[PDB]
């Protein structure tokens, strides 16, 4: 009885750990994508300034 | 007794030739181990002498891979302790005593280069375990821990496969099967507590799931081993 509950909890704990790992991986990709958009604007602004000169 | 003596004489005659003995030893390794055990089991002097001569002929240097065959016999069949006991024992035949001395010398030479890691590897290959002292003494499980993770954790993978096979065959709940399962669980717990990098490999291979499922076994020793494995996994 109790062993089954512990086994089910371990699977739930693994899912929580897996979800936590997924969140960290998603956050890094989201942060990289957000940083890329900001970096793209600076390059575009610099390119326009370079083209104007 | 007469039939056994005739069979032993026929075996000795067949093993007189080196090629025939080499062929028979490979094809009848279990039979060779059984004969070695019966040599000490039997009380007849003539039967014991015949068995010792048959063993020596198989272990004779004239046979192909004689050193390899002798080492394999001494490892799998535990021939060295049996030969040591026979040497300490007494026999009524001088030829039997000389054969026992030669077998003991050969076994000692084979075991000179033997190692605890080699014994553990042989036991894992045999897919059998009876709580061997390498699985009990922390020295072997500490020195050979690094070697267990070698070759992409080949030893750990073999142990996980053996545990899965025992779980599949654990429905019988035989005493020997229960002992083997307990020994495998103890070995897995040791190899997980030491060098914990194999925990992910065990989880990927399904060894952790098999260990968790084994907690339903009715054996008290199996239940304790499963509890210890669970504690080593995430418990304290």
Swiss-Prot record, chain B:
Subcellular location(s) per record: Vacuole membrane
Reported phenotype of the disruption mutant: Increases the ATPase activity of membrane-detached V-ATPase V1. Abolishes growth at pH 7.5 and in the presence of calcium chloride, abrogates growth at pH 5.0.
Domain of life: Eukaryota
Miscellaneous comment as given in the Swiss-Prot or TrEMBL entry: Present with 22500 molecules/cell in log phase SD medium.
Function: Subunit of the V1 complex of vacuolar(H+)-ATPase (V-ATPase), a multisubunit enzyme composed of a peripheral complex (V1) that hydrolyzes ATP and a membrane integral complex (V0) that translocates protons. V-ATPase is responsible for acidifying and maintaining the pH of intracellular compartments. This subunit is essential for activity, but not assembly, of the enzyme complex. This subunit is also required for silencing the ATPase activity of V-ATPase when V1 is detached from V0.
Assembly with partners or alone: V-ATPase is a heteromultimeric enzyme composed of a peripheral catalytic V1 complex (components A to H) attached to an integral membrane V0 proton pore complex (components: a, c, c', c'', d, e, f and VOA1). Interacts with YND1.
Family, as annotated: Belongs to the V-ATPase H subunit family.
Protein name: V-type proton ATPase subunit H
Name of encoding gene: VMA13
Residues of the full protein shown: 240 to 475 of 478
């Amino acid at each position: 009885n109790g062993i089954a509950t512990l086994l089910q909890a371990e699977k739930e704990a693994h899912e929580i750990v897996s979800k936590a790992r997924k969140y960290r991986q998603d956050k890094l990709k989201q942060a990289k994508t957000d940083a890329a958009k900001e970096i793209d604007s600076y390059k575009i602004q610099k390119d326009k300034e370079l083209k104007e000169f | 007794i007469q039939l056994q003596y005739h069979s032993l004489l026929l075996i000795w005659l067949l093993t007189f030739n080196p090629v025939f003995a080499n062929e028979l030893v490979q094809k009848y390794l279990s039979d060779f181990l059984d004969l070695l055990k019966l040599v000490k089991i039997t009380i007849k002097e003539k039967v014991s002498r015949l068995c010792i001569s048959i063993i020596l002929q198989c272990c004779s240097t004239r046979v192909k891979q004689h050193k390899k065959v002798i080492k394999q016999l001494l490892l799998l069949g535990n021939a060295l302790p049996t030969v040591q006991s026979l040497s300490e024992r007494k026999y009524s035949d001088e030829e039997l005593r000389q054969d026992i001395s030669n077998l003991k010398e050969i076994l000692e030479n084979e075991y000179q280069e033997l190692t605890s890691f080699d014994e553990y590897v042989a036991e894992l290959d045999s897919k059998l375990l009876c709580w061997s002292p390498p699985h009990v003494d922390n020295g072997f499980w500490s020195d050979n821990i690094d070697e267990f993770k070698k070759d992409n954790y080949k030893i750990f993978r073999q142990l996980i496969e053996l545990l899965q096979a025992k779980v599949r065959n654990g429905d019988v709940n035989a005493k020997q099967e229960k002992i083997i399962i307990q020994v495998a669980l103890n070995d897995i717990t040791h190899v997980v507590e030491l060098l914990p990098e194999s925990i992910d490999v065990l989880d990927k291979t399904g060894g952790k799931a098999d260990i968790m499922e084994l907690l339903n076994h009715s054996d008290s020793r199996v239940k304790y081993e499963a509890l210890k494995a669970t504690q080593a996994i995430i418990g304290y």
